[PDB]
Amino acid sequence: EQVCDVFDIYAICACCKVENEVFNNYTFRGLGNKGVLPWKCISLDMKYFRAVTTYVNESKYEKLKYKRCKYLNKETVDKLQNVVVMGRTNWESIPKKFKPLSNRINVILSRTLKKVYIINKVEDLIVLLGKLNYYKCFILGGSVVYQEFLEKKLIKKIYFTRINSTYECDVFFPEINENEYQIISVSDVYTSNNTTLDFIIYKKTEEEDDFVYFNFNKSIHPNDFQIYNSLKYKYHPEYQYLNIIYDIMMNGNKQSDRTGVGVLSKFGYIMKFDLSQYFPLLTTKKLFLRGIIEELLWFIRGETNGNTLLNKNVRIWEANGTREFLDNRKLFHREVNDLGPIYGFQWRHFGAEYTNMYDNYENKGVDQLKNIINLIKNDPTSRRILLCAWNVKDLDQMALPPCHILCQFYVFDGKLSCIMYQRSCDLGLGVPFNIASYSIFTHMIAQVCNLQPAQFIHVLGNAHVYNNHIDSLKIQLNRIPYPFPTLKLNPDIKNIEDFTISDFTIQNYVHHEKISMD
Amino acid sequence: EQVCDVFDIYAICACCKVESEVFNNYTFRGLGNKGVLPWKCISLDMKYFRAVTTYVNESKYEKLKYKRCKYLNKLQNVVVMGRTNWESIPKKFKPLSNRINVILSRTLKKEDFDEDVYIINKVEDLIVLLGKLNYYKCFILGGSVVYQEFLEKKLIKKIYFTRINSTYECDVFFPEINENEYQIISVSDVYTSNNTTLDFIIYKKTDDEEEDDFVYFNFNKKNSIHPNDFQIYNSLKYKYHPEYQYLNIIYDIMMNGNKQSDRTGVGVLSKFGYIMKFDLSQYFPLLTTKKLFLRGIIEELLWFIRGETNGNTLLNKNVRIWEANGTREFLDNRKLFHREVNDLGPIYGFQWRHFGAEYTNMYDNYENKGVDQLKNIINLIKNDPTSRRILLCAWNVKDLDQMALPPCHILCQFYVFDGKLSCIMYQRSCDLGLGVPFNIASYSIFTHMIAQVCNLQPAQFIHVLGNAHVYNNHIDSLKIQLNRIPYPFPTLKLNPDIKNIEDFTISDFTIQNYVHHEKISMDM
Numbered sequence A: 001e002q003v004c005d006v007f008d009i010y011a012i013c014a015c016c017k018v019e020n021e022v023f024n025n026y027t028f029r030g031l032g033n034k035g036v037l038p039w040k041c042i043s044l045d046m047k048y049f050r051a052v053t054t055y056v057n058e059s060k061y062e063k064l065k066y067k068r069c070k071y072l073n074k075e076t077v078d079k080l081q082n083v084v085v086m087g088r089t090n091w092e093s094i095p096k097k098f099k100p101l102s103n104r105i106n107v108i109l110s111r112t113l114k115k116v117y118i119i120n121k122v123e124d125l126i127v128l129l130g131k132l133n134y135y136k137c138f139i140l141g142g143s144v145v146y147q148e149f150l151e152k153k154l155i156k157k158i159y160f161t162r163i164n165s166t167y168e169c170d171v172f173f174p175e176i177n178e179n180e181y182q183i184i185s186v187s188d189v190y191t192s193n194n195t196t197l198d199f200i201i202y203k204k205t206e207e208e209d210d211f212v213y214f215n216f217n218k219s220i221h222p223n224d225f226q227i228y229n230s231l232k233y234k235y236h237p238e239y240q241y242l243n244i245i246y247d248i249m250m251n252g253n254k255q256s257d258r259t260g261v262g263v264l265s266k267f268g269y270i271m272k273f274d275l276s277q278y279f280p281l282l283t284t285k286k287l288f289l290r291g292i293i294e295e296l297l298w299f300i301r302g303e304t305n306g307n308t309l310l311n312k313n314v315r316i317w318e319a320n321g322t323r324e325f326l327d328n329r330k331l332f333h334r335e336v337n338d339l340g341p342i343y344g345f346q347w348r349h350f351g352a353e354y355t356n357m358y359d360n361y362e363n364k365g366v367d368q369l370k371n372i373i374n375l376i377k378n379d380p381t382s383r384r385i386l387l388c389a390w391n392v393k394d395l396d397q398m399a400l401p402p403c404h405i406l407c408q409f410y411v412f413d414g415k416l417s418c419i420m421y422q423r424s425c426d427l428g429l430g431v432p433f434n435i436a437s438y439s440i441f442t443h444m445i446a447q448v449c450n451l452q453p454a455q456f457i458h459v460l461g462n463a464h465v466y467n468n469h470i471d472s473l474k475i476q477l478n479r480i481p482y483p484f485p486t487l488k489l490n491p492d493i494k495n496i497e498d499f500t501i502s503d504f505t506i507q508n509y510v511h512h513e514k515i516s517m518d
Numbered sequence B: 001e002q003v004c005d006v007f008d009i010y011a012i013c014a015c016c017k018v019e020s021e022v023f024n025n026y027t028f029r030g031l032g033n034k035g036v037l038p039w040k041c042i043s044l045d046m047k048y049f050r051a052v053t054t055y056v057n058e059s060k061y062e063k064l065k066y067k068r069c070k071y072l073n074k075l076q077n078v079v080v081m082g083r084t085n086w087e088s089i090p091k092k093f094k095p096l097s098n099r100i101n102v103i104l105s106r107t108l109k110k111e112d113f114d115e116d117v118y119i120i121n122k123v124e125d126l127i128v129l130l131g132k133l134n135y136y137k138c139f140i141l142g143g144s145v146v147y148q149e150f151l152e153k154k155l156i157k158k159i160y161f162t163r164i165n166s167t168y169e170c171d172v173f174f175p176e177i178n179e180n181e182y183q184i185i186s187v188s189d190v191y192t193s194n195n196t197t198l199d200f201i202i203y204k205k206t207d208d209e210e211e212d213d214f215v216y217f218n219f220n221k222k223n224s225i226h227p228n229d230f231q232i233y234n235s236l237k238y239k240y241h242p243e244y245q246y247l248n249i250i251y252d253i254m255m256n257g258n259k260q261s262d263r264t265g266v267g268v269l270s271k272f273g274y275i276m277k278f279d280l281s282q283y284f285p286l287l288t289t290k291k292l293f294l295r296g297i298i299e300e301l302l303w304f305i306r307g308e309t310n311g312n313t314l315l316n317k318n319v320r321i322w323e324a325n326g327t328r329e330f331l332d333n334r335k336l337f338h339r340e341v342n343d344l345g346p347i348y349g350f351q352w353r354h355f356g357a358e359y360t361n362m363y364d365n366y367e368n369k370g371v372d373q374l375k376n377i378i379n380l381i382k383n384d385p386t387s388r389r390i391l392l393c394a395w396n397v398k399d400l401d402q403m404a405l406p407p408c409h410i411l412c413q414f415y416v417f418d419g420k421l422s423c424i425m426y427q428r429s430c431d432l433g434l435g436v437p438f439n440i441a442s443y444s445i446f447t448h449m450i451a452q453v454c455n456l457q458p459a460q461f462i463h464v465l466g467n468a469h470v471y472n473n474h475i476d477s478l479k480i481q482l483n484r485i486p487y488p489f490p491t492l493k494l495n496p497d498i499k500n501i502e503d504f505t506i507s508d509f510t511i512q513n514y515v516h517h518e519k520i521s522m523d524m
């Protein structure tokens, strides 16, 4: 029977980053600078902190007192609040207008303070706790306090805010030992005061029956997903991707492939990412975006020339443009790397007769990109703001038919959302890039129409995991996401055709190690 | 305290429809015929009945034992049967296994039974018996005389009620349940077993560390619709009937919808992005919380498949779905000044059979012009079933302004596994109160037709909604409808001799066992 369990002693803290980088939990360590917080107010962390440290559940107290008494070999302890323990320097950095911390029993560790309790050794806290009625006990820091409370093994859980930005710091949270503590929960990702952040939790290592009745009809070893399955709360939006992989692995249909690879597949999924709060660049592996952005730029120019991409070493379309690949598609009369009437051609020239990749198509066919931008600007409540690449007439002349069938747009209260329907979804290699690409695009349309981006919504049709990706995705599922990065566009660009590679910046991308999916 | 609460006395039953139109909960009331059951085995109900009457939770007995102790001062359930019920059970099934069996009788006594059973000769003796036994719950198993007297005396806490959605000859009937004594608290998924659909409803008499963590994670959490406006809807504990996928979306839009104007002038509440899934192997999802007829939508689908764009064809069969979109005034407001009345332009049927052909008029012969995508997808399903390119697309960007209006149903994608066909339809714009009920029915039918002609069985119709809206003028009608409890769905049957997609006619379709609430004008 350990003290921290008896007295419900917990740590709570907020850690920023500090000035081929490798990332780990320790990336998030920064606590303070010059007696104060490294950052200007991050008001969302403040609200979380207040609510965690003040929250009490009276009905649960009877049971805690019991345990505490039986431990201290007593029969009695002799409006419920929590205890909060601050180091002296910590207590001095708090604006006086906020001291003592409201609705909490304030305890201060100090050797040089004299009488809101003061105490001058840790063991004196245990004593004080044995003589109080309190719900739980929260160690609020600073650095010295966490250090000693942690080495003395006095901490049941760590409520750890990850501030995904870099500050100058002079004091650090200690390195949490992964054999001592493991993460059991991860929150939604949020933006506050110009940074992303998330909240994670380390742990020390009648109607009921009716529910059963309604359930009366209901080569992967899930034990391999130890970390995945041991998490309790999985609210980080990256879990929308990871959970689909889990689902396909566990419940997928075995089917054969043109490459003889084999897939597990399922049909019909939705993911939704809130672009006002973050940029959903997967963090459970490394992803690179230069190629993805050039591809989008090449679509917007309405290009179908694969050489343009190849000469910038963007090799996404290379295999689809070879002599052999075109001949197998019966495009015997197509030049190498002429991909035919694919996305760019359909976005700007839908319905025009395709000749070759060098022809001049200006003012030929339907310029649906211009059309949707005008509809957003002039008739935002239109339900016909669609951009469609599936030209049934032209499919057989494409190097391959589009995987990204259409985008539809929705405008409410100055904000833009986008649904993209994908007929075919390689969860392991394709879908991560695909989410990035259409999130970028959503931002680009929003900016040129003076709107703010809201949600990117991804509908997956035939959704598959290649059998040669399974071992890699197993490794990936047992990694814990980090808070997402942010995308910044150059704010000067007000025309969809005016963006260049230099107008795009990913900020604060923290990621696990790259994985060769094969 | 009541006797039924102390001793945990429940009823479980199964009721079919009977021969003798308005529907109500009393539609399901057939129990028995000539001393045995009205149907041959409905095995899924037998499985449910065994699961419910045999399940026990040992960890909860201690509190039960305490409660009954106060009242008076391996674990198993007790089951109680009328004598006629007992004699109806096949010998090999008696006594009911893993249960304490109790029989009510005057004419027979314990010397008349070989089996491990308790005989009781009045209800009062049941209660005495329950006071003497160790048991989890007590299930009253019928028949009609027994249900009658247990209900009359208020000795039933809940009724586990199976709705068998088919009609049989009966001579005995469950009591009419008094809606002021008993109300439905829960409704199951809908299933098919032994060629009938059925569901299961429930009437009621009228480390918690991780719990605090739940609260912490919620530290950061609209429309003047009123709470009491959904009393019945919100009083249900389990809402597992697939009709709730539709009803819950309506609720979501009412409560969280964004207010917006629209091309129509009415304004709406809107949201963006929903998915519904319907299991066509188990039911035909025609909405039951209001009345729908399918003659028109079936004639529409046949007209689509034929490649037709002539609205007169529909009007001549008294189908008016497209009438307003073909008037002189409508076409002119679309700037289609050189279009004949009821010439709807290159819409669905034209795109399905002739995508990319130049549209002239509704009378032209377009044979072998454009892409016959309907044919192409049938060929793909038959010869390349694992293709990820089996898509039928009505949104032809080039032809949009020539259409009476652009399609709402943008595309269907198909999926085949293990001899079974699934279908996703993506709907760019979705009128929840009027359009969507019919849209679900149309694409569900089309999935069955495509499956049959490719020698597959239907699996799931998946409906993806883009712009999803409730018209302000529909809100009061939808409020009414949401306080209705769905009935088990109907089934759809097709003439099995039809083996080509082009060869269906209206009499090739039958909708069987449609039970529904009354018709609702969505508008005033």
Ligand SMILES: NC(=O)C1=CN([C@@H]2O[C@H](COP(=O)(O)OP(=O)(O)OC[C@H]3O[C@@H](n4cnc5c(N)ncnc54)[C@H](OP(=O)(O)O)[C@@H]3O)[C@@H](O)[C@H]2O)C=CC1
Binding pocket: A012, A013, A014, A015, A030, A031, A032, A033, A034, A035, A036, A037, A086, A087, A088, A089, A090, A091, A093, A109, A110, A111, A112, A113, A119, A120, A121, A122, A140, A141, A142, A143, A144, A145, A146, A148, A171
């Ligand atoms: N971001 C976050 O989550 C948090 C950050 N901070 C930041 O951390 C910094 C403060 O950290 P740090 O410098 O380590 O200071 P601390 O808050 O850890 O204070 C240390 C002091 O506490 C007293 N003390 C410590 N251990 C004991 C003990 N065992 N017995 C008795 N008294 C003890 C002593 O005061 P004495 O001199 O009287 O002996 C000691 O010098 C600031 O910059 C602050 O803003 C603060 C709170 C949380």
Ligand SMILES: NC(=O)C1=CN([C@@H]2O[C@H](COP(=O)(O)OP(=O)(O)OC[C@H]3O[C@@H](n4cnc5c(N)ncnc54)[C@H](OP(=O)(O)O)[C@@H]3O)[C@@H](O)[C@H]2O)C=CC1
Binding pocket: B012, B013, B014, B015, B030, B031, B032, B033, B034, B035, B036, B037, B081, B082, B083, B084, B085, B086, B088, B104, B105, B106, B107, B108, B120, B121, B122, B123, B141, B142, B143, B144, B145, B146, B147, B149, B172
């Ligand atoms: N579909 C369903 O869910 C169910 C249907 N059934 C069907 O229902 C029919 C049987 O119903 P029903 O004809 O109403 O008969 P019951 O099963 O209700 O049995 C009636 C007999 O039970 C005895 N009995 C009942 N109440 C008492 C009492 N208070 N004290 C003493 N004895 C009592 C008497 O036996 P005695 O004459 O010997 O004195 C009486 O004649 C059959 O067709 C059966 O298959 C039955 C149960 C479930």
Ligand SMILES: CCc1nc(N)nc(N)c1OCCCCOc1ccc(-c2ccc(C(=O)O)cc2)cc1
Binding pocket: A012, A013, A014, A037, A041, A045, A046, A049, A093, A094, A095, A098, A139, A140, A141, A159, A160, A161
């Ligand atoms: C960083 C928070 C935090 N977060 C987490 N998760 N764990 C913590 N243990 C933690 O901190 C230590 C708690 C005591 C400090 O209590 C303060 C109160 C108010 C201001 C304050 C400063 C500036 C403004 C303003 O400029 O408006 C307003 C308030 C600072 C500290």
Ligand SMILES: CCc1nc(N)nc(N)c1OCCCCOc1ccc(-c2ccc(C(=O)O)cc2)cc1
Binding pocket: B012, B013, B014, B037, B041, B045, B046, B049, B085, B088, B089, B090, B093, B140, B141, B142, B162
């Ligand atoms: C309809 C059941 C039922 N359902 C629900 N929901 N509540 C009920 N209270 C209920 O009944 C009460 C059970 C007493 C009769 O228990 C039987 C057991 C087996 C066969 C039996 C007969 C024939 C065959 C065969 O021919 O295959 C197989 C089994 C009949 C009755």
Ligand SMILES: O=c1ccn([C@H]2C[C@H](O)[C@@H](COP(=O)(O)O)O2)c(=O)[nH]1
Binding pocket: A400, A401, A403, A404, A424, A425, A426, A427, A429, A430, A431, A434, B388, B389
């Ligand atoms: O942007 C893309 C393009 C392709 N794919 C995957 C889906 C399939 O695995 C393959 C294309 O093969 P077909 O589905 O077209 O046959 O590429 C994606 O995930 N994303």
Ligand SMILES: O=c1ccn([C@H]2C[C@H](O)[C@@H](COP(=O)(O)O)O2)c(=O)[nH]1
Binding pocket: A383, A384, B263, B405, B406, B408, B409, B429, B430, B431, B432, B434, B435, B436, B439
């Ligand atoms: O099969 C159909 C046809 C139409 N609509 C509704 C959606 C809109 O309320 C309206 C079409 O208007 P636009 O979205 O095209 O503006 O009709 C449906 O729900 N289903």
